[PDB]
């Protein structure tokens, strides 16, 4: 009986949340930006072709200087590219060749890695010996790591396959905070520009925005009918876009506490692997499983460009901090850096 | 002109050296066989791993056999969603599936008429018909044959195989269950199942793996380049 009344209370609260959301919902984003001009056909052209990886590229992250990038491709290699001249500044061997995520520290001194080994490994770039070495091999997760990101040189937040997220202190090597509440395993994670709040998408078809300091889920968002594979923050920090296996991208808003827009097309049937916003936040790029990426308008939901340069699934997507180039990694073991003209 | 200074030229040299190292490491990795071990928890997977040879994830066991390095990955310690990481093993040389022949009677803790070995064949069907494993041969290791022989004298095989229409002898029972296991393959044109019964000495059941991997690498060599 107690479980029954608790379930009744739960569904009553869920219905109240839905009523509140539909109450604050008055006009659609498409209606509001109906009269604005739409961007022309985006004409990205491949500017660089980073080669050297020998297996499916699974992770890629841009450096803060917008010149150095880090890639992982499940061949036991962590390659750091100077994209301007197409050079390899480092090639970090991996203890476990099942990496699924990467992160470049904002200070540029450390590089994160992690995969099916349930372990987040930190690698020190700026060292006196001259060779990249492991600084702290974080452990404590009971599931594969799907996304890792840096807050600063001594703190990260890692999303893993044990349906939980964890904020780790690098120096102590301990989970200084643990975030729980997702029924299914989480697959993506992204921080706010001020690194105060962060969103995480899971196979539960829900995206939860957590607070780093207080340590509990501030908000939860639903709307997808399948697992959420990618999440990314708006440059403003008041909205975020999630891509899922149901072949749709969705733009959620923080303050509105509900869904805002849906980017989908009938010709699109495969799911989303990665998402990324443009510097101004108007262009939303999404990597797909049909071996090409799509560039939508974040305000009009009209497809603005297609990046067809890969012959395998596009698994990575990143936009430089200055919004200059766009890096795409795919399972064909090639990275492509695109730019406009 | 060259439009490159000394530091840029030295960086290019460093990148070329890194490229050479990556090429050599990739060649060494290609000169290697990769296997993925699957099956139920109570299927003797630890025993077969021991016969071939801190975190509950993917464990890698490496062993040599007549100049054929083997890397075998056991992912049985992963309790998350399989469909979210199984594609990471898309390029494996072969898949080793272990099924215990003595679990035809035993039922799992959640005993709801779903037999342990019924779940075993459901898992085998899911693995065999997976989109990522269209061209990946499966080595079917049938374990605990002696104890299955002991058990079949008393417990009939018709309890969990009602459609059985043969004698209750171990040989015919094993042949029939082998054909039933191979029946679930819906991609007979591309992949083939190499079924072997675990024996006392590790030599026989590592030699079976060596022969199977040799045959499959020959087949992919003959099929990748356009021949055959």
């Amino acid at each position: 009986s107690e479980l029954d009344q608790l379930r009744q209370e739960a569904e009553q609260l869920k219905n109240q949340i839905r009523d509140a959301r539909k109450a604050c919902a008055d006009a659609t984003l498409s209606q509001i930006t109906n009269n604005i001009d739409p961007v022309g056909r985006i004409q990205m052209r491949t500017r660089r072709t980073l080669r050297g990886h020998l297996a499916k590229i699974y992770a890629m992250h841009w450096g803060t200087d917008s010149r150095l990038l880090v890639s992982a491709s499940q061949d036991g290699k962590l390659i750091i590219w100077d994209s301007y001249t197409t050079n390899k500044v480092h090639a970090i061997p991996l203890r476990s060749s099942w990496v699924m995520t990467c992160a470049y520290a904002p200070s540029g001194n450390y590089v994160a890695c992690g995969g099916l080994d349930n372990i987040c490994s930190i690698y020190n770039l700026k060292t006196r010996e001259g060779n990249v070495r492991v600084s702290r091999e974080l452990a404590g997760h009971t599931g594969y790591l799907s996304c890792c990101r840096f807050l600063d040189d001594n703190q990260i937040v890692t999303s893993s396959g044990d349906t939980t997220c964890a904020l780790w202190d690098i120096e102590t090597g301990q989970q200084t905070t643990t975030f729980t509440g997702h029924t299914g395993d989480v697959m993506s994670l992204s921080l706010a520009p001020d690194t105060r709040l962060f969103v995480s998408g899971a196979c539960d078809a829900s995206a939860k925005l957590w607070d780093v300091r207080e340590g509990m889920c501030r908000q939860t968002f639903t709307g997808h009918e399948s697992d959420i594979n990618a999440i990314c923050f708006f440059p403003n920090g008041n909205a975020f876009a999630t891509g899922s296996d149901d072949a749709t991208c969705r733009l959620f808003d923080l303050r509105a506490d509900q869904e805002l827009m849906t980017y989908s097309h009938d010709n699109i049937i495969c799911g989303i692997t990665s998402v990324s916003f443009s510097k101004s936040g108007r262009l939303l790029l999404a990597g797909y499983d049909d071996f090409n990426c799509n560039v939508w308008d974040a305000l009009k939901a009209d497809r603005a460009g297609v990046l067809a340069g890969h012959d395998n699934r596009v698994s990575c997507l990143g936009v430089t901090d200055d919004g200059m180039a766009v890096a795409t990694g795919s399972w064909d073991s090639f990275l492509k850096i695109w730019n406009g003209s | 002109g060259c439009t490159l200074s000394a530091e840029d030229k030295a960086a290019v040299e460093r990148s070329k050296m890194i490229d050479r190292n990556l090429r050599e490491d990739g060649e060494k990795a290609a000169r290697e066989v990769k296997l993925l071990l699957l099956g139920a928890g109570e299927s003797g997977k630890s025993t077969i791993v021991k016969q071939m040879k801190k975190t509950t994830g993917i464990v890698e066991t490496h062993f040599t056999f007549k100049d054929l390095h083997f890397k075998m990955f056991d992912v049985g310690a992963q309790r998350s969603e399989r469909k979210k990481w199984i594609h990471c093993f898309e390029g494996v040389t072969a898949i080793i599936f272990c099924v215990a022949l003595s679990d035809y009677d035993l039922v799992l803790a959640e005993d709801e008429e779903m037999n342990r070995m019924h779940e075993s064949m459901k898992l085998f069907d899911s693995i065999c018909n997976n989109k990522w494993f269209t061209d990946t041969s499966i080595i079917l290791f049938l374990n605990k044959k002696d104890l299955f022989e002991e058990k079949i004298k008393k417990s009939p095989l018709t309890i969990c195989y009602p459609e059985y229409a043969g004698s209750n002898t171990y040989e015919e029972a094993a042949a029939y269950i082998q054909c039933q296991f191979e029946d679930l393959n819906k991609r007979k044109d591309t992949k083939e199942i190499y079924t072997h019964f675990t024996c006392s000495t590790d030599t026989k059941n590592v030699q079976f793996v060596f022969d199977a991997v040799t045959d499959v690498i020959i087949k992919n060599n003959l099929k990748d380049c356009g021949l055959f």
Partner: single-chain antibody
Amino acid sequence: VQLVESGGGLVQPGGSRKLSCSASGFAFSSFGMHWVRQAPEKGLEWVAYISSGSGTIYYADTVKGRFTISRDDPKNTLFLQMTSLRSEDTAMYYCVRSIYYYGSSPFDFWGQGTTLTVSSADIVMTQATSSVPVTPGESVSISCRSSKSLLHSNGNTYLYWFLQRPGQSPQLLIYRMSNLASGVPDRFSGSGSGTAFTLTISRLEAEDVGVYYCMQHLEYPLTFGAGTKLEL
């Protein structure tokens, strides 16, 4: 990180010697290793250069042909054979490590060097001042000049500032005219655009006295300067 050298001594002119450097504490095989010389009471002078993997080998004009540089990476050693030693070869020889990638700090570490006693070009770097008297707590400026603009087309200036304390091996202060080498106080700073470069020492104190050297890294016939001696 530690570089030690051996093989110096007295040599009759026309002889031969093999100086050796025994690197330790770092990845030697991934470092390009140089050779510098310093005539007694004189400025520095680049002698030779070998890249990682022995790819490109460069020699100074005055020693080309006589000097043969080589390295044994498995044993972490670097040898410099000399043939037909002349009386102009009497100098303190230092061995310098240097890696090259984006954001790297070449010439960061210098060995202690060994003493040897014998019985056209481009980028002539001139430092007008030679001896400057200083007082602790004050701010000083050091100026150097180059024959041609050091600002390459990639936006990088290739001017390096080194400091040699009295009776000690030189250490790297500033690389690429603006970046501070790791392990030095933040009071140092560099300036200049194409030809005239300035080192600005704010709140100078002891342990900072000694000679200061400017260096170019555009054309591999690397040229130092006379160096300015800050004396108390």
